[PDB]
Amino acid sequence: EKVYQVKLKVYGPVHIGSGKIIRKQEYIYDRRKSLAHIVDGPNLVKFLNKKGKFTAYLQYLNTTKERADLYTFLRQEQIDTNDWKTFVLYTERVNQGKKGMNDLHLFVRDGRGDLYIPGSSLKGALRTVLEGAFHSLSISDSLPIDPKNLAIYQKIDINKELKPMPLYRECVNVGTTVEFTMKINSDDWTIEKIEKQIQQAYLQYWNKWFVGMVTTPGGKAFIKGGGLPSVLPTVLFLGGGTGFPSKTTHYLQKPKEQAQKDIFAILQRRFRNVYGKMATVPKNVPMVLKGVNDSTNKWYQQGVCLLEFQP
Amino acid sequence: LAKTKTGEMIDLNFARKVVEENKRVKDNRGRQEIVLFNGLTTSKLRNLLELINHVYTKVYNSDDTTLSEDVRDELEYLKVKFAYESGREPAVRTFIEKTYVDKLVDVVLKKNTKKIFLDYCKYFEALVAYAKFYR
Amino acid sequence: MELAKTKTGEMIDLNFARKVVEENKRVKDNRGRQEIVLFNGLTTSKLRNLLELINHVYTKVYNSDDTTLSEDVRDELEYLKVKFAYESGREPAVRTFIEKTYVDKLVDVVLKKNTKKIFLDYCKYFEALVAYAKFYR
Amino acid sequence: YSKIRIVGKIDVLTGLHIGGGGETSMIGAIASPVVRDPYSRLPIIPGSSIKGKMRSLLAKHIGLIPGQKMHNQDAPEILRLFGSSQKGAIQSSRLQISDAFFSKASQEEFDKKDLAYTETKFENTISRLTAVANPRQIERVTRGASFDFHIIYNVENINEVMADFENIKTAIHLLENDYLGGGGTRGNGRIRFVIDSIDTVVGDFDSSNL
Amino acid sequence: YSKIRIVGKIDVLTGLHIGGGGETSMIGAIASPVVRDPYSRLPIIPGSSIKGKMRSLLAKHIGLIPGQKMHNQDAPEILRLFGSSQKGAIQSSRLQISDAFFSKASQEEFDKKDLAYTETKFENTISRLTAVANPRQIERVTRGASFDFHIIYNVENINEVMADFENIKTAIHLLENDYLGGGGTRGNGRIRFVIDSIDTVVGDFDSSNL
RNA sequence: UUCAGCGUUCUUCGGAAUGUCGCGCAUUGGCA
RNA sequence: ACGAGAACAUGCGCGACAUUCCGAAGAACGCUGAA
């Protein structure tokens, strides 16, 4: 069974969902800092009972149920940042697309707590492309990545406009390279075949859905800001929040009109409030593109990565 | 576990009873749309279940019969997390006040035993299961 | 076993378990090939998961010398009805199976009897449901 | 009649999951528990799993006979090392692989870092047509955990011993490149084998050269 | 005529499976249970199992004549210790090995901490051809559990007693490096005779140095 | 323009043991 | 002054051998709601 090193470069930030979403009240975000401090709840609680401010915390959250940010409260009580460090697990830069972060999706971490990409996630991303076996393909868990390459990126819905959604996802930063080891059986999989399939699937994704998405005014704004890099080859979307055109094989196997109609029927059946009320197939199915931006105001497509294979 | 107001024990049977009491038909547009606890949905219930499950796994991995200090701190956070959720959503508030979960966590804290925490976790699990059953 | 009497007064027994599987057996010619469908779509894996739950309670009581059901055993039985309810809500075929076989109703009878024999009898009936489901597939 | 004793450590390079059955599970909690020692409630690696993976890896490496149906049809080396129940040709197993227990060194290491022995991974199966997902929570032994492995070899034939130990070394190499436990093709189960001491515990065989 | 009583404990290093059949098994339950005393429903280590395993290991250590078909062809020391059945050469066995019974102290150690005496182990076999796994559940005695042992040695010839006990020690040493019961080549039945107590219960023989 | 996330999946499907022995030998009987 | 008296159904013997709890399975799909 041939073994190939698999290097993944993240063109656009990737969030693999640990399975945990944290409310703004749980974390500390300072807009001027542009830094969010992840706080282990039980320790913060214990700290606030020790200081006697726990009653004040409870009254604060009750007073403003819709907005319960910790930063505000901690500032209101004049608690020093040195005092904060005790109940702060770590700190990560924030790429806000709007103000105050509404909620945070935390990246997946092991029992040791090092950030890593599950070989299961990569395998599934490849499998979506390569369908058309799967015990012969082997994908390993990623080598743990340095936390310096993790930041929070705002979720922006791009459909005739760029609207920042109330979702924030810790994501592997752009430029970061993730290393995996792939083992394949010559009688089932050839690495040239895998790479060619991925390239063809990308091309199908680009010509059937991406171009129509660009034609919308929000897509034009996304492209003007640098949303589509020139290099974007072999492209795999491994991130959460990428969208319906990936993770499904409709655009990879069906004609553009046929694939659009089938996906539209699927969305009408599953989401009867957004697409069920609609009576006609729109220009793009699904309607909305997913995008992150940066402080340099450079836009990135969510979860877009380039895959390199070496013998 | 504990006895509620008007002298009713907390049981999985009581979980079924409290889930079915707050069930209302409320048919809309000639179609039946079941609503629980004045509109509580399954997503909020699953969120609360995840809150429970983290500490449940932590306790289940432990061998001692007494809750450790970190378990007690997690239960205090659980009290805070329920209060934050009850605040934002009226349906979550109604569910919490009808199921007496925010008081059962205090009962578990005072008992300071693995068995009482496991039974409370089972009770919350039965709440989720019976909400799924009556949906 | 005379575990229970079902609506219309029919007894619950291993022979009844064979009959209940037989009544709820249909032949659907999906893709031309004739396929057996039990309880409007019950799968082997779902029934095996239900059988796993019974086994965990069973190993306790079956090993136990004492006749009366232990309080923890009674707890596991109450949990079983909660799991029954959960699986019924999560799968229509499982709800059909529970309604037709009356397995959930029987667990309450086993709790009422507080007897190892009525427990072993409930376990036998559940095992027959599984065995007959295998035989008629 | 000599017995050679090999002791050492199996080290978890990636989260390792060996399935266990009959474990009650809470709704929304871990639904795929790893095998655990009932007394200490600690993760354990079954010697049956190690023996099966090593035997399968070695048998496939030397080469299965075409249309092989049974384990008793393996190559004679594999039959001598791992046994054979063939009718009229029953062969003893020189390898006696035992249960690998969670080492006290790795347990103390974890307790120093306040880390649990078994991590919980969240995975899902996504439909590639409707994009409907089915979330699963699994249990994997945390990376860097070590297990005390203990293997007994029996010296039935003095001449055969050197080739047998060469085959055991080959099987260890196979199991290092290969995974142990389930979901290996999705990254789980990568392991490392270190040796503490190869000693002859019974008889006068000289195991220092091994 | 003297009788020396050897009383002690056997400790389950790894899970012990000595099978006992005769009972139909429920679907989905353990296919192969362990032998258990009927009255206490507690597992037992049969004296026949211990005697047979000790005799086999001692015969392998002393040596087997080429093409040995019967157990009466063993070495004269083995026939002296464990008994013989030849026509005109029936040797009474000096060793009477009793059934080991689960220790009350191990029972208390398990009743507290609420641990079951026996553990269900979920294994599978993976076909060489279809690569299809067929599962099984086997009962094993838990590692912490300990079995009280009881052996009687009859002093028929006072001269050989030391040598005979040496053989016994050798056999026990072998049994410590070997396993007991079934499935021991995949990690089952590892034991140790940590507790020994030797006393002349009948007669006037001197067992102080035994 | 601001303010917020919300809803849905919570494990699934297979495989559930199999094959091998199922008492043998001595006395006894039988033959001589 | 019982078809009787004397007479251990006994000796030897591992419920054992072969058997991966595996195979497949991206934590992510829609984007909207309120003011």
From Swiss-Prot, chain A:
UniProt cross-references to Pfam families, sorted A to Z: RAMPs (PF03787)
An example molecular function term from Gene Ontology annotations: RNA binding
Matching InterPro entries: CRISPR-assoc_Csm5 (IPR010173), RAMP_III_fam (IPR005537)
NCBIfam families: cas_TM1807_csm5 (TIGR01899)
Annotated family: Belongs to the CRISPR-associated Csm5 family.
Misc remark: Encoded in a type III-A CRISPR locus.
Its job: CRISPR (clustered regularly interspaced short palindromic repeat) is an adaptive immune system that provides protection against mobile genetic elements (viruses, transposable elements and conjugative plasmids). CRISPR clusters contain spacers, sequences complementary to antecedent mobile elements, and target invading nucleic acids. CRISPR clusters are transcribed and processed into CRISPR RNA (crRNA). This subunit might be involved in maturation of a crRNA intermediate to its mature form.
Identification of the protein by name: CRISPR system Cms protein Csm5
From Swiss-Prot, chain C:
GO molecular function: RNA binding
InterPro entries: CRISPR-assoc_prot_Csm2_III-A
Keyword entries, A-Z: Antiviral defense, RNA-binding
Pfam family, one: Csm2_III-A
GO BP field: defense response to virus
NCBIfam families given in the database record: cas_TM1810_Csm2 (TIGR01870)
Misc. comment: Encoded in a type III-A CRISPR locus.
Function: CRISPR (clustered regularly interspaced short palindromic repeat) is an adaptive immune system that provides protection against mobile genetic elements (viruses, transposable elements and conjugative plasmids). CRISPR clusters contain spacers, sequences complementary to antecedent mobile elements, and target invading nucleic acids. CRISPR clusters are transcribed and processed into CRISPR RNA (crRNA). This subunit may be involved in monitoring complementarity of crRNA and target RNA.
Subunit structure: Part of the Csm effector complex that includes Cas10, Csm2, Csm3, Csm4 and Csm5.
Similarity field: Belongs to the CRISPR-associated Csm2 family.
UniProt protein name: CRISPR system Cms protein Csm2
Organism: Enterococcus italicus (strain DSM 15952 / CCUG 50447 / LMG 22039 / TP 1.5)
Phylogenetic classification of the source organism: Bacteria, Bacillati, Bacillota, Bacilli, Lactobacillales
From Swiss-Prot, chains D, E:
Biological process, per Gene Ontology: defense response to virus
Subunit structure and binding partners: Part of the Csm effector complex that includes Cas10, Csm2, Csm3, Csm4 and Csm5.
One annotated GO molecular function: endonuclease activity
EC number: 3.1.-.-
Described function: CRISPR (clustered regularly interspaced short palindromic repeat) is an adaptive immune system that provides protection against mobile genetic elements (viruses, transposable elements and conjugative plasmids). CRISPR clusters contain spacers, sequences complementary to antecedent mobile elements, and target invading nucleic acids. CRISPR clusters are transcribed and processed into CRISPR RNA (crRNA).
Keywords, in A-Z order: Antiviral defense, Endonuclease, Hydrolase, Nuclease, RNA-binding
Additional record remark: Encoded in a type III-A CRISPR locus.
Protein name: CRISPR system Cms endoribonuclease Csm3
Family, similarity comment: Belongs to the CRISPR-associated Csm3 family.
NCBIfam families for this protein: cas7_TM1809
Top class in the EC scheme: hydrolase
